[PDB]
Write a protein that binds this ligand. Structure first.
Ligand SMILES: *[C@@H]1O[C@H](CO)[C@@H](O)[C@H](O)[C@H]1NC(C)=O
Lengths: 45, 48
């Protein structure tokens, strides 16, 4: 029950995420490249 | 005990009086005064 604010690595609000397609159920060249970890990654599938 | 002083003539005088009313309004930011553009100082300042 507090209102805490902090400085840390976060995903910025309303940011643009790259869309990758995956689905031998592989019709339109569904694959995955090597991405960049950076200092933190948000993965939504 | 039996003498009085009554004036026979007069004058109109204009006098000036100066009075302060308001002063300058000042706004102070804790950031870019205490720490400046320094994220290391800004991280420690979040507790204040
Ligand atoms: C997506 O967002 C980023 C950061 O806000 C911006 O640099 C980029 O131009 C945006 N792309 C499109 C297509 O809106």
């Amino acid at each position: 029950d507090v209102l805490h604010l902090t400085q840390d690595y976060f995903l910025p609000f309303d940011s643009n995420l790259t869309q990758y397609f995956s689905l031998s159920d592989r019709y339109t060249y569904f694959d995955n490249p090597i991405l960049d970890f950076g200092d933190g990654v948000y993965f939504a599938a | 005990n039996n003498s009085i002083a009554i004036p026979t003539n007069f004058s109109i005088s204009v006098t000036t009086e100066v009075m302060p009313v308001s002063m300058a309004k000042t706004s102070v930011d804790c950031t870019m005064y205490i720490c400046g553009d320094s994220l290391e100082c800004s991280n420690l300042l979040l507790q204040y």
